[PDB]
Amino acid sequence: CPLMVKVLDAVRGSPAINVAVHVFRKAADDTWEPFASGKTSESGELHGLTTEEEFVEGIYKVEIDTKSYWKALGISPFHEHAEVVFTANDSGPRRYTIAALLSPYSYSTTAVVTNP
Amino acid sequence: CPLMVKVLDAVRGSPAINVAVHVFRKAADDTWEPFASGKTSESGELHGLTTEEEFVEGIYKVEIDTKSYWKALGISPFHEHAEVVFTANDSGPRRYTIAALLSPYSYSTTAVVTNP
Amino acid sequence: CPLMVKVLDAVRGSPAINVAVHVFRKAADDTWEPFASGKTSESGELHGLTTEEEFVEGIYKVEIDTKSYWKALGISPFHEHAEVVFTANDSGPRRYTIAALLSPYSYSTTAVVTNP
Amino acid sequence: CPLMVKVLDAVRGSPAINVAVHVFRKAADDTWEPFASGKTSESGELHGLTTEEEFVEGIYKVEIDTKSYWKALGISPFHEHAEVVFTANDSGPRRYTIAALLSPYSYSTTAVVTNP
Ligand SMILES: Cc1c(Cl)cccc1Nc1ncccc1C(=O)O
Ligand SMILES: Cc1c(Cl)cccc1Nc1ncccc1C(=O)O
Ligand code: NA
Ligand code: NA
C-alpha cells in the first residue's frame, strides 16, 4: 500500500484512536469523488487504504474527522475537520505517509515520502 | 475586521508575503459559495476581508494558496493549499485570527478567537 | 526592542497570558549567564526585555516556563519548559521575534528575523 | 527500551537521517550529566538508547543537533539545536517516543507515551 495516515493527540500525548478518515480523488469535472476510508487503529495508524494499481497520479484529499474525536473526549474544538490536499506524482518516492498532530484549536500536518 | 489571516514562512524566518487567500461559506444547498478573497501584505497579514454585518453565523473555509507561494520562490511543494474549515459566530459575534506556518512538506495552523 | 517573545495556547485558542520567560547568554567560560526575564501580557507578548546596546552578538537561550503555565490551569503537562537556543547578531544587528504555540504534550516554535 | 527518538524533515518530506542526538540526566547538583547518545537511522529513528533498569524517574534532556543537519544540506538554519526537557514518571505509560519535525527557522516536538 502506497498511502498511510497517522494521527497523534497533543493534549493526551497519545495516538489518536478510532478517528474517521476519508480519502477523495479529484474528478475531471473538479468534484471530489470518494476513494477510500477507514478508522485509525490503537496505534493511531490507518493502513490498507489503497493499492499501487489503484493509486494513480492525480489530486487527492485526505479528510480527518477531528471534530468528532474531540467531542468524544469532552473537549470543545475549533475545526470541522482537518483537510490535506496534494498531488500524487510517479517521479517521486513511492510511499506516502500523511501525518497529523491534533490540538483543540490547532493542527500540524506533514508528508513523509520515501522509496522502499 | 472580525476575520484576519496571518501567514509565516518557516524556511526563511519571515512573513509569507503575497499569499493568495480565498474564503468560502457553506450555502443552504451544501455548496461552498465564494465569500471574500485577498492576499497577504509585507507583514504576512491580510486585513479587511469582511465586516461585522456580513460575517454572519456559518461554516467557513479559508483556503491559503501555499503551492502558488512556494512555486513563485522556486520550490516544488507537497500540498495544493492549506484549508481551514470552522463554524463561526455560533455563540454570537467573535473575532477570529487564522494563522499558518508554512514549510514545503508541512504546515501548522491555529486560531485565536476573542470576544470583543 | 530587538527581542520579542510571543506565546499562544493551542487548547483554548487564545494568547498564553502570564507565562514566565528567562533569557540567558553564553559567557566566555561556556556557562549560561542570566541576561533578562519577564512575563507575557494579556496579548501573549513580552516586550522590553533588552536594548540595541545590550543585545550584542552571542549565543542566547530563551526558556519559556510552560510547565508552570499549564499547572496554574490545572493540567499536568509533559515538558519542563520550552528552550530556544540561537546565535544572534552575527551579521550585524537584527530584530528577533521568538514565538511558541503550546499544547500539554507538544509545542512548536518559530523565529521571525528582520533587518531594521 | 523505554525511550525512542524520531526526527522528520519538513523541507524535503523525509526522515532526518544521521542526526546526532544526546540525552542527559539532571544530577543532584543541577548539572546535566551525559546519559546516552546516537545518530538517527535511515528511518529517522534512534532505538536502543537505554533500558528499563537504567531509565529511572528524574528530569531528562534530549538535545537534537539540528544545526549540523541543515549545514550538511547547504541550508542556513536558525537554532543551535532543539532541546526537549521532561520528567520521567513511573505512574504513566511505560514507553516514551520523543518526536521532532524540523524546518530551518522552526521546529515542532511532541511526546507519545504509551503502555505495551
Ligand atoms: C508561532 C506560531 C506557530 Cl509555532 C504555528 C502557527 C502559528 C503561529 N503564530 C501565530 N498564530 C496565531 C496568531 C498569531 C501568530 C503570530 O505568530 O503572530
Ligand atoms: C512528531 C510530529 C510532529 Cl511534531 C508534527 C506532525 C507529525 C509528527 N509525527 C510524524 N509525522 C509524520 C510521519 C510520522 C510521524 C510520527 O510521529 O511517527
Ligand atoms: Na447559537
Ligand atoms: Na560576524
Coordinates of C-alpha atoms and ligand atoms in Angstrom, one line a residue:
Chain A
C1 CA 0.0 0.0 0.0
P2 CA 1.4 3.4 -1.1
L3 CA -0.7 5.6 1.3
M4 CA -0.8 5.5 5.1
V5 CA -2.4 8.0 7.5
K6 CA -1.2 8.6 11.1
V7 CA -2.9 10.8 13.7
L8 CA -1.5 11.9 17.1
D9 CA -3.1 13.7 20.1
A10 CA -1.1 16.7 21.5
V11 CA -3.4 17.0 24.6
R12 CA -3.0 13.5 25.9
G13 CA 0.4 12.6 24.3
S14 CA -1.0 9.5 22.6
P15 CA -2.1 8.1 19.3
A16 CA -5.5 9.4 18.2
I17 CA -7.5 6.2 18.2
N18 CA -10.7 5.5 16.2
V19 CA -10.6 8.7 14.1
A20 CA -12.5 8.6 10.9
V21 CA -10.5 9.3 7.8
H22 CA -12.0 9.8 4.3
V23 CA -9.9 10.0 1.1
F24 CA -11.2 11.6 -2.2
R25 CA -9.8 11.8 -5.7
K26 CA -10.5 14.9 -7.8
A27 CA -12.6 14.1 -10.9
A28 CA -12.3 15.7 -14.3
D29 CA -15.3 17.9 -13.5
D30 CA -13.5 19.2 -10.4
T31 CA -15.7 17.4 -7.9
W32 CA -14.3 15.2 -5.1
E33 CA -15.1 11.5 -5.6
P34 CA -14.9 9.1 -2.7
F35 CA -11.8 6.9 -3.0
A36 CA -11.1 5.1 0.3
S37 CA -11.9 5.4 4.1
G38 CA -11.3 3.9 7.5
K39 CA -10.7 4.5 11.2
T40 CA -7.3 4.8 12.9
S41 CA -6.1 1.8 14.9
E42 CA -4.9 1.7 18.5
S43 CA -1.5 3.0 17.2
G44 CA -3.1 6.0 15.5
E45 CA -2.5 4.5 12.1
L46 CA -4.7 3.6 9.1
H47 CA -3.2 1.0 6.7
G48 CA -4.5 -0.7 3.6
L49 CA -6.4 2.3 2.2
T50 CA -5.4 1.5 -1.4
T51 CA -3.1 -0.4 -3.8
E52 CA -0.3 0.5 -6.2
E53 CA -2.6 -0.3 -9.1
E54 CA -5.4 2.0 -7.9
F55 CA -3.3 4.9 -6.7
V56 CA -2.6 6.7 -10.0
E57 CA -1.3 10.2 -10.4
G58 CA -3.8 12.9 -9.6
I59 CA -5.1 15.3 -6.9
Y60 CA -6.2 13.7 -3.6
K61 CA -7.9 15.0 -0.4
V62 CA -7.5 13.3 3.0
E63 CA -10.2 14.5 5.4
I64 CA -9.6 13.7 9.1
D65 CA -12.7 14.0 11.3
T66 CA -11.2 15.8 14.2
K67 CA -14.4 17.4 15.5
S68 CA -15.9 14.1 16.4
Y69 CA -12.7 13.0 18.0
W70 CA -12.6 15.9 20.4
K71 CA -16.3 15.7 21.2
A72 CA -16.0 12.1 22.2
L73 CA -13.3 13.2 24.7
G74 CA -15.5 16.0 26.1
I75 CA -13.4 18.9 24.6
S76 CA -14.7 21.8 22.5
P77 CA -12.8 22.0 19.2
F78 CA -12.3 24.7 16.6
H79 CA -12.1 23.0 13.2
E80 CA -14.8 20.9 11.5
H81 CA -12.1 18.6 10.2
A82 CA -8.5 18.7 9.0
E83 CA -8.0 18.6 5.2
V84 CA -4.8 17.6 3.4
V85 CA -4.8 18.2 -0.4
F86 CA -1.9 17.0 -2.5
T87 CA -0.8 15.7 -5.9
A88 CA 0.5 12.2 -6.3
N89 CA 3.5 12.1 -8.6
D90 CA 5.1 9.0 -10.0
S91 CA 8.5 10.6 -10.3
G92 CA 9.0 11.0 -6.6
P93 CA 9.4 8.3 -4.0
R94 CA 6.7 5.6 -3.9
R95 CA 5.3 5.6 -0.3
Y96 CA 3.3 8.5 1.1
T97 CA 2.7 8.9 4.9
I98 CA 0.3 11.7 5.8
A99 CA 0.6 12.6 9.4
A100 CA -1.3 15.0 11.6
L101 CA -0.8 16.2 15.2
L102 CA -4.1 17.5 16.7
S103 CA -4.9 20.1 19.4
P104 CA -8.4 21.6 20.0
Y105 CA -7.6 24.9 18.3
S106 CA -4.6 23.9 16.1
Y107 CA -3.2 21.1 13.9
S108 CA 0.1 20.4 12.2
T109 CA 0.4 18.1 9.2
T110 CA 3.4 16.7 7.3
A111 CA 4.2 14.3 4.5
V112 CA 6.9 11.7 4.6
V113 CA 7.5 10.4 1.0
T114 CA 10.1 7.6 0.7
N115 CA 11.3 4.9 -1.6
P116 CA 11.4 1.2 -0.4
Chain B
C1 CA -12.4 43.2 10.9
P2 CA -13.8 40.1 12.6
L3 CA -11.6 37.9 10.4
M4 CA -7.8 38.2 9.9
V5 CA -5.3 35.8 8.3
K6 CA -1.6 35.7 9.1
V7 CA 1.0 33.5 7.3
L8 CA 4.6 32.9 8.2
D9 CA 7.5 31.2 6.3
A10 CA 9.4 28.6 8.3
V11 CA 12.2 28.3 5.8
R12 CA 13.2 32.0 5.7
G13 CA 12.1 33.1 9.2
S14 CA 9.9 35.8 7.7
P15 CA 6.3 36.8 7.0
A16 CA 4.9 35.0 4.0
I17 CA 4.2 37.9 1.6
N18 CA 1.8 37.9 -1.4
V19 CA 0.0 34.7 -0.4
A20 CA -3.5 34.4 -2.0
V21 CA -6.3 33.6 0.3
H22 CA -9.9 32.6 -0.7
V23 CA -12.7 32.4 1.9
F24 CA -15.9 30.4 1.2
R25 CA -19.1 29.9 3.2
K26 CA -21.4 26.9 3.1
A27 CA -24.7 27.6 1.5
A28 CA -28.2 26.2 2.3
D29 CA -27.7 23.7 -0.5
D30 CA -24.4 22.5 1.0
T31 CA -22.1 24.1 -1.7
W32 CA -19.2 26.4 -1.0
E33 CA -20.0 29.9 -2.0
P34 CA -17.4 32.5 -2.6
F35 CA -17.3 34.9 0.4
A36 CA -14.1 37.0 0.3
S37 CA -10.6 37.0 -1.0
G38 CA -7.3 38.8 -0.8
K39 CA -3.5 38.5 -0.4
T40 CA -1.1 38.9 2.5
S41 CA 0.8 42.2 2.9
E42 CA 4.5 42.7 3.6
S43 CA 3.8 41.8 7.3
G44 CA 2.2 38.5 6.3
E45 CA -1.2 39.7 7.4
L46 CA -4.5 40.0 5.4
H47 CA -6.9 42.5 6.8
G48 CA -10.3 43.9 5.6
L49 CA -11.8 40.6 4.3
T50 CA -15.2 41.2 5.7
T51 CA -17.4 43.3 8.1
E52 CA -19.3 42.6 11.3
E53 CA -22.6 42.9 9.3
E54 CA -21.6 40.4 6.5
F55 CA -19.8 37.8 8.7
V56 CA -22.9 36.0 9.9
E57 CA -23.1 32.6 11.5
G58 CA -22.0 29.8 9.2
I59 CA -19.4 27.2 8.2
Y60 CA -16.4 28.9 6.6
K61 CA -13.4 27.6 4.7
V62 CA -10.2 29.6 4.5
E63 CA -8.1 28.4 1.6
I64 CA -4.5 29.5 1.7
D65 CA -2.8 29.1 -1.7
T66 CA 0.5 27.6 -0.5
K67 CA 1.5 25.9 -3.7
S68 CA 1.5 29.1 -5.7
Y69 CA 3.5 30.8 -2.9
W70 CA 6.3 28.1 -3.0
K71 CA 6.4 27.8 -6.8
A72 CA 7.0 31.6 -7.1
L73 CA 10.1 31.1 -4.9
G74 CA 11.4 28.1 -7.0
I75 CA 10.3 25.3 -4.7
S76 CA 8.1 22.4 -5.7
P77 CA 6.0 21.8 -2.5
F78 CA 3.8 18.9 -1.4
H79 CA 0.3 20.4 -0.7
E80 CA -2.0 22.1 -3.1
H81 CA -3.2 24.6 -0.5
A82 CA -3.9 24.7 3.2
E83 CA -7.6 24.6 4.1
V84 CA -9.1 25.7 7.4
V85 CA -12.7 24.8 8.0
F86 CA -14.7 26.0 11.0
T87 CA -18.1 27.1 12.4
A88 CA -18.1 30.9 13.2
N89 CA -20.3 33.0 15.4
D90 CA -22.5 30.2 16.8
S91 CA -22.5 31.8 20.3
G92 CA -22.6 35.3 18.9
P93 CA -20.0 37.5 17.2
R94 CA -16.4 36.7 17.7
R95 CA -13.1 38.0 16.2
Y96 CA -11.0 35.3 14.5
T97 CA -7.3 35.2 13.6
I98 CA -6.4 32.3 11.4
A99 CA -2.6 31.7 11.3
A100 CA -0.5 29.4 9.3
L101 CA 3.2 28.5 9.4
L102 CA 4.5 27.1 6.1
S103 CA 7.2 24.6 5.1
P104 CA 7.5 22.8 1.7
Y105 CA 6.2 19.5 3.0
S106 CA 4.3 20.6 6.1
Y107 CA 2.1 23.3 7.7
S108 CA 0.7 24.2 11.1
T109 CA -2.4 26.2 11.6
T110 CA -4.0 27.7 14.7
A111 CA -6.9 30.0 15.6
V112 CA -7.1 32.9 18.1
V113 CA -10.7 33.6 19.0
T114 CA -11.6 36.7 21.0
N115 CA -14.9 38.2 22.2
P116 CA -14.9 42.0 21.5
Chain C
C1 CA 13.1 46.2 21.3
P2 CA 15.3 43.9 19.2
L3 CA 14.0 40.8 21.0
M4 CA 10.2 40.0 21.5
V5 CA 8.6 36.7 22.7
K6 CA 5.0 35.7 21.8
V7 CA 3.2 32.7 23.2
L8 CA -0.1 31.1 22.1
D9 CA -2.3 28.4 23.7
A10 CA -3.5 25.7 21.3
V11 CA -6.1 24.2 23.7
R12 CA -8.0 27.5 24.3
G13 CA -7.3 29.3 21.1
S14 CA -6.0 32.3 22.9
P15 CA -2.8 34.2 23.9
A16 CA -0.9 32.4 26.6
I17 CA -1.0 35.0 29.4
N18 CA 1.3 35.3 32.4
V19 CA 4.0 33.0 31.0
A20 CA 7.4 33.4 32.6
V21 CA 10.4 33.8 30.3
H22 CA 14.1 33.7 31.2
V23 CA 16.8 34.7 28.7
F24 CA 20.4 33.6 29.1
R25 CA 23.6 34.4 27.2
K26 CA 26.6 32.1 26.9
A27 CA 29.6 33.5 28.6
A28 CA 33.3 33.3 27.7
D29 CA 33.7 30.3 30.1
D30 CA 30.8 28.5 28.4
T31 CA 28.3 28.9 31.2
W32 CA 24.8 30.4 30.8
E33 CA 24.6 33.8 32.3
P34 CA 21.3 35.4 33.2
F35 CA 20.5 38.1 30.6
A36 CA 16.9 39.3 31.0
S37 CA 13.5 38.0 32.2
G38 CA 9.8 38.8 32.2
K39 CA 6.3 37.5 31.7
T40 CA 3.8 37.6 28.8
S41 CA 1.0 40.2 28.8
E42 CA -2.7 39.8 28.1
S43 CA -1.8 39.7 24.4
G44 CA 0.6 36.9 24.9
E45 CA 3.6 39.2 24.1
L46 CA 6.6 40.1 26.1
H47 CA 8.2 43.4 25.1
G48 CA 11.1 45.4 26.6
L49 CA 13.5 42.6 27.5
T50 CA 16.6 44.3 26.2
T51 CA 18.0 47.3 24.2
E52 CA 20.0 47.6 21.0
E53 CA 23.1 48.5 23.1
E54 CA 22.9 45.5 25.4
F55 CA 21.8 42.8 22.9
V56 CA 25.3 42.2 21.5
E57 CA 26.5 39.2 19.4
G58 CA 26.2 35.9 21.3
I59 CA 24.5 32.6 21.8
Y60 CA 21.2 33.1 23.6
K61 CA 18.8 30.7 25.3
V62 CA 15.1 31.7 25.7
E63 CA 13.5 29.5 28.3
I64 CA 9.7 29.6 28.3
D65 CA 8.2 28.3 31.5
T66 CA 5.5 26.1 30.0
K67 CA 5.1 23.6 33.0
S68 CA 4.3 26.4 35.4
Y69 CA 1.8 27.8 32.9
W70 CA -0.2 24.5 32.5
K71 CA 0.0 23.7 36.2
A72 CA -1.7 27.0 37.0
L73 CA -4.6 26.0 34.8
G74 CA -5.0 22.5 36.3
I75 CA -3.1 20.5 33.6
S76 CA -0.2 18.2 34.2
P77 CA 2.0 18.7 31.1
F78 CA 4.9 16.7 29.6
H79 CA 7.7 19.3 29.2
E80 CA 9.5 21.2 31.9
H81 CA 9.9 24.2 29.7
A82 CA 10.5 25.1 26.0
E83 CA 14.0 26.2 25.2
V84 CA 15.0 28.2 22.1
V85 CA 18.8 28.4 21.5
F86 CA 20.3 30.6 18.8
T87 CA 23.2 32.8 17.7
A88 CA 22.2 36.4 17.4
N89 CA 23.6 39.4 15.5
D90 CA 26.4 37.6 13.9
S91 CA 25.9 39.6 10.6
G92 CA 25.1 42.8 12.5
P93 CA 22.0 43.9 14.5
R94 CA 18.7 42.2 13.7
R95 CA 15.3 42.2 15.3
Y96 CA 14.1 38.8 16.6
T97 CA 10.6 37.5 17.4
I98 CA 10.5 34.2 19.1
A99 CA 7.1 32.6 19.0
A100 CA 5.8 29.4 20.6
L101 CA 2.5 27.5 20.3
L102 CA 1.7 25.4 23.4
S103 CA -0.2 22.1 24.0
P104 CA 0.1 19.9 27.0
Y105 CA 2.3 17.3 25.3
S106 CA 3.7 19.3 22.4
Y107 CA 5.0 22.7 21.3
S108 CA 6.0 24.5 18.1
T109 CA 8.4 27.3 18.0
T110 CA 9.5 29.6 15.1
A111 CA 11.5 32.8 14.6
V112 CA 10.9 35.9 12.6
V113 CA 14.1 37.8 11.9
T114 CA 14.1 41.3 10.4
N115 CA 16.8 43.8 9.5
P116 CA 15.7 47.3 10.7
Chain D
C1 CA 13.8 0.1 25.6
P2 CA 11.5 2.8 27.1
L3 CA 12.8 5.8 25.1
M4 CA 12.9 6.3 21.3
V5 CA 13.7 9.5 19.4
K6 CA 12.3 10.2 15.9
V7 CA 13.2 13.2 13.6
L8 CA 11.5 14.3 10.4
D9 CA 12.5 16.9 7.8
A10 CA 9.7 19.3 6.7
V11 CA 11.7 20.8 3.8
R12 CA 12.3 17.5 2.0
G13 CA 9.4 15.5 3.3
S14 CA 11.6 12.7 4.6
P15 CA 13.1 11.2 7.7
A16 CA 16.0 13.2 9.1
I17 CA 18.9 10.8 8.6
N18 CA 22.2 10.7 10.5
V19 CA 21.2 13.4 13.1
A20 CA 23.2 13.4 16.3
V21 CA 21.1 13.0 19.5
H22 CA 22.4 13.4 23.0
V23 CA 20.5 12.5 26.2
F24 CA 21.3 13.9 29.6
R25 CA 20.0 13.3 33.1
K26 CA 19.8 16.1 35.7
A27 CA 22.1 15.4 38.6
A28 CA 21.5 16.4 42.3
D29 CA 23.7 19.5 41.9
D30 CA 21.5 20.7 38.9
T31 CA 24.1 19.9 36.2
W32 CA 23.3 17.8 33.1
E33 CA 25.2 14.5 33.1
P34 CA 25.6 12.5 29.8
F35 CA 23.2 9.6 29.8
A36 CA 23.0 8.1 26.2
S37 CA 23.6 9.2 22.6
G38 CA 23.4 8.1 19.0
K39 CA 22.6 9.0 15.4
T40 CA 19.2 8.6 13.7
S41 CA 18.9 5.8 11.2
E42 CA 17.6 5.8 7.6
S43 CA 14.1 5.8 9.0
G44 CA 14.8 8.9 11.2
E45 CA 14.7 6.8 14.3
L46 CA 17.1 6.2 17.2
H47 CA 16.4 3.0 19.1
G48 CA 18.3 1.3 22.0
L49 CA 19.3 4.4 23.9
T50 CA 18.6 2.9 27.3
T51 CA 17.0 0.1 29.3
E52 CA 14.1 -0.2 31.7
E53 CA 16.6 -0.8 34.6
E54 CA 18.6 2.4 33.8
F55 CA 15.8 4.8 32.9
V56 CA 14.7 5.7 36.4
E57 CA 12.4 8.6 37.4
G58 CA 14.0 12.1 37.0
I59 CA 14.5 15.0 34.7
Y60 CA 16.0 14.3 31.3
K61 CA 17.1 16.5 28.3
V62 CA 17.2 15.3 24.7
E63 CA 19.4 17.5 22.5
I64 CA 18.9 17.1 18.7
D65 CA 21.8 18.6 16.7
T66 CA 19.7 20.4 14.1
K67 CA 22.3 23.0 13.1
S68 CA 24.8 20.4 11.7
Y69 CA 21.9 18.6 9.9
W70 CA 20.9 21.7 8.0
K71 CA 24.5 22.7 7.3
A72 CA 25.2 19.3 5.7
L73 CA 22.3 20.0 3.3
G74 CA 23.6 23.5 2.4
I75 CA 20.8 25.4 4.2
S76 CA 21.3 28.2 6.7
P77 CA 19.4 27.4 10.0
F78 CA 18.3 29.5 13.0
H79 CA 18.7 27.2 16.1
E80 CA 21.9 25.8 17.5
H81 CA 19.9 22.7 18.5
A82 CA 16.5 21.5 19.6
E83 CA 16.1 20.7 23.3
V84 CA 13.4 18.6 24.8
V85 CA 13.3 18.6 28.7
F86 CA 10.8 16.4 30.6
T87 CA 10.3 14.4 33.7
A88 CA 10.1 10.6 33.5
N89 CA 7.2 9.3 35.7
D90 CA 6.6 5.7 36.6
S91 CA 2.9 6.2 37.1
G92 CA 2.2 7.0 33.5
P93 CA 2.5 4.7 30.5
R94 CA 5.9 3.0 30.1
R95 CA 7.2 3.8 26.6
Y96 CA 8.2 7.4 25.6
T97 CA 8.6 8.5 22.0
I98 CA 10.1 12.0 21.6
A99 CA 9.5 13.2 18.0
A100 CA 10.6 16.4 16.3
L101 CA 9.7 17.9 12.9
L102 CA 12.4 20.2 11.6
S103 CA 12.4 23.4 9.4
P104 CA 15.3 25.9 9.1
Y105 CA 13.6 28.5 11.3
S106 CA 11.1 26.4 13.2
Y107 CA 10.6 23.1 14.9
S108 CA 7.7 21.2 16.5
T109 CA 8.1 18.5 19.1
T110 CA 5.6 16.1 20.7
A111 CA 5.7 13.2 23.1
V112 CA 3.8 9.9 22.6
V113 CA 3.6 8.0 25.9
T114 CA 2.0 4.5 25.7
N115 CA 1.7 1.3 27.6
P116 CA 2.5 -2.0 25.9
Ligands
LIG1 C1 4.0 30.8 16.4 C2 3.1 30.1 15.5 C3 3.3 28.8 15.3 CL1 4.6 28.0 16.0 C4 2.4 28.0 14.5 C5 1.4 28.6 13.8 C6 1.1 30.0 14.0 C7 2.0 30.7 14.9 N1 1.8 32.1 15.1 C8 0.6 32.8 15.3 N2 -0.5 32.0 15.4 C9 -1.7 32.7 15.6 C10 -1.8 34.1 15.7 C11 -0.6 34.8 15.7 C12 0.6 34.2 15.4 C13 1.8 35.0 15.4 O1 2.9 34.4 15.2 O2 1.7 36.3 15.5
LIG2 C1 6.4 14.5 15.5 C2 5.4 15.1 14.6 C3 5.1 16.4 14.7 CL1 5.9 17.4 15.9 C4 4.2 17.1 13.9 C5 3.5 16.3 13.0 C6 3.7 15.0 12.8 C7 4.7 14.3 13.6 N1 5.0 13.0 13.5 C8 5.0 12.3 12.4 N2 4.9 12.9 11.2 C9 4.9 12.2 10.0 C10 5.2 10.8 10.0 C11 5.3 10.2 11.2 C12 5.3 10.8 12.4 C13 5.5 10.1 13.6 O1 5.5 10.7 14.7 O2 5.6 8.8 13.5
NA3 NA -26.2 29.6 18.6
NA4 NA 30.1 38.3 12.0

